[PDB]
């Protein structure tokens, strides 16, 4: 008995060599391998296979290799590959990627992926499954921002803020021990993973260090607090001791130094350079040159992504209005012109494609969109396919190479940068089960189901009063994972080793899982997956033209994007 390939794919999701279109983009991913045994695929429902004595084992207790949850027939899109497998979860972690079912009667069952009495099922046939997004540039300004992030498949927020205070509105900073404690407590009610950055500013170590001991997971240096040589140096000294990452928004005004001064203060130490293109801030006009260094972990924020015909008008004006910049003051005009640059924004698109900028991020509510990191990553990939063509290293007419390079920018790479990739950031055995299911038609646009710690936290589902869950209105909603005390087990508060050792969570009464920040100080650009290129980037100070390997980088803005008006009501 043979099944044709269209029918197979319609019933069990695609298999080896099949391709799938990413939403309404021109990007196609291809299934690279498939862990199943044809004829023994797992599936659930009336007369289906996962039933007692058949694909479900009736003998074993939960401890005996049985799963808490099996995601059947998932098409996994991850830095580690694009491939088809069942995914097994237990104790809130991914414990097996392979083939689930019952070894009584089935060939090829991964030995710890037994479906038993204890096992829940999620049908992922026909879905793309990714790791949850890791947003490392979040301003905690408005708690409604959390659902916005979940709806576009983001599951970890790193940043800072105390709500809509001016400090927080401008910077990803939760300053000092008291504010940090307060936000750690607030975090007990946010249904998403969180890590909190302190203020990376000071001329003595102690004022800075005491934030790390209080619970911060890192530090932010921001020009609005004085991105001076001293603040950079003391921050990196604290970070090398505490094993946490430092993010920088450098001195756009060049007041105490130019870019090379900032680099000298950094002195070869590891640092995450935020919105590296510079629209979002940094040494005018050449900040983007940070992205060629081996000790810099470079990220973009999302409003410049990708370059479009409306990009500049929107930014010029956003900037002018937020900084109370008057149209008839020529210093303001010159300031705005030195900061918003088509040359570097166009070039940023290309840098992403070449694996020179490693990360995306939002800059949520302070010059960026909480729910569009993932969305705009894929719009950028699609624009580059259109303008540059398939990358050299593509095979079989698929875009798998580019797909892996881009998915890495918002999953594994931010995790690596922040020192949390031992827990989150990819679909690998041993990591926390933060998973996003996507219908391919909605890929990167609206998440179908967001799993946090092995329990669904958010879902596009319909009328709660209906006979079934699909009738209208279908909208994003918080699920049982966010309710009651279950919010504690399904989410991680990431904190410094020293805070953890000093008993901060007990002190504050935190009931969330506590994640340790570690291994941030011994890494570089070479550790960013599929985005590990170092090079000399030159930015011409008169024309702002960008060169790399003596080649000028120019690109055109586009009038239209995918993943836009087809999908959104506003």
């Amino acid at each position: 008995m043979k099944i044709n390939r269209q029918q197979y794919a319609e019933s069990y999701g695609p298999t080896v060599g099949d391709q799938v279109r990413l939403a309404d983009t021109d990007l196609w991913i291809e299934v690279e391998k498939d862990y199943t045994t044809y004829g023994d695929e797992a599936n659930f429902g009336g007369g289906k296979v996962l039933r007692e004595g058949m694909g479900e084992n009736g003998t074993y207790t939960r401890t005996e290799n049985v799963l808490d949850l099996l995601l059947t027939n998932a098409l996994i899109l991850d830095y580690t590959g694009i491939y088809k497998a069942d995914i097994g979860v237990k104790d809130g972690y991914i414990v097996g990627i392979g083939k689930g079912g019952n070894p009584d009667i089935m060939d090829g069952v991964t030995p710890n992926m037994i479906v038993g009495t204890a096992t829940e099922v999620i049908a992922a046939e026909g879905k793309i499954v990714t790791a949850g997004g890791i947003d490392t540039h979040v301003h905690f300004i408005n708690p409604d921002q959390v659902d916005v992030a979940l709806a576009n498949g983001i599951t970890t927020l790193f940043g800072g803020g105390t709500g809509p205070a001016e400090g927080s509105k401008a910077t990803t900073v939760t300053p000092g021990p008291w504010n940090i404690e307060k936000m750690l407590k607030s975090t007990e009610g946010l249904p998403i993973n969180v890590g909190i950055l302190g203020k990376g500013h000071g001329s003595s170590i102690a004022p800075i260090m005491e934030q790390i001991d209080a619970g911060a997971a890192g530090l932010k240096i921001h020009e609005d607090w004085g991105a001076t040589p001293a603040s950079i140096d003391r921050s990196l000294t604290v970070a090398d001791e505490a094993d946490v990452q430092v993010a920088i928004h450098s001195d756009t005004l060049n007041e105490a130094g130019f870019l090379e001064d900032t680099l000298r203060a950094i002195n070869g130490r590891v640092i995450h350079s935020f919105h590296v293109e510079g629209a979002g801030g940094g040494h005018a006009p050449d900040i983007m040159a940070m992205a060629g260094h081996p000790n810099v972990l470079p990220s973009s924020t999302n409003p410049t992504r990708p370059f479009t015909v409306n990009t500049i008008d929107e930014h010029l004006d956003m900037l002018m209005v937020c900084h109370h910049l008057k149209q008839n003051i020529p210093e303001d005009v010159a300031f705005a012109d030195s900061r918003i640059r088509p040359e570097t924004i166009a070039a940023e698109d290309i840098l992403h494609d070449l694996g020179i900028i490693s990360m995306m991020s939002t800059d949520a509510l302070a010059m960026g969109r909480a729910g569009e990191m993932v969305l705009r990553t894929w719009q950028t990939a699609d624009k580059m396919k259109k303008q540059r063509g398939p990358l050299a290293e593509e095979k079989n007419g698929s875009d798998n190479f580019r797909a892996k390079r881009y998915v890495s920018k918002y999953t594994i790479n931010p995790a690596i940068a922040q020192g949390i990739a031992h827990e989150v950031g990819s679909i690998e055995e041993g990591k926390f089960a933060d998973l996003v299911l996507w219908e391919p038609k909605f890929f990167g646009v609206k998440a179908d189901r967001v799993i946090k710690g092995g329990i669904i936290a958010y879902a596009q589902i319909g009328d709660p009063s209906a006979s079934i869950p699909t009738p209208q209105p279908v909208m994003g909603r918080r699920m049982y994972g966010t309710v009651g005390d279950l919010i504690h087990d399904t989410n991680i508060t990431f904190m410094s080793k020293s805070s953890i050792q000093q008993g901060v969570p007990a002190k504050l009464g935190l009931k969330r899982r506590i994640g340790t920040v570690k291994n941030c100080r011994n890494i570089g650009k070479k550790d960013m997956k599929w985005n590990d290129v170092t090079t000399d980037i030159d930015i011409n100070p008169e024309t702002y033209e960008v060169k790399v390997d003596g080649e000028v980088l120019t690109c055109e803005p586009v009038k239209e994007l995918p993943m836009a008006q087809r999908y959104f009501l506003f």
Partner: protein, 122 residues
Amino acid sequence: NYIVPGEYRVAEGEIEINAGREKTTIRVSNTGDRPIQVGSHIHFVEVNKELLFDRAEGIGRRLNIPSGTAARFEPGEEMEVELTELGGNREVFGISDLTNGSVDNKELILQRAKELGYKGVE
């Protein structure tokens, strides 16, 4: 170049299920007055008592149909079905409690079947 969002472009070929396992065809009849539908992975010897067939030929086997589908027998219907061999450890537990162990214990399964009135124990 019309775009269907999220469409598949499946490769050429066809997928052979249960490859390499012995196949066996038997005749089976629903002697009862209500419909009986049988799934792909139920140990075939343990189906509804009122299905008459050579029960020995169901031992260690299941229907050779795609995973998750089922054969339907209307009342009084007789038809042929194709079986394939169980894989893995070739053990069956529960279901109708005819096996509870290795499918190699043919005698024991058949004795249990016959005492409980499963039709066609020959």
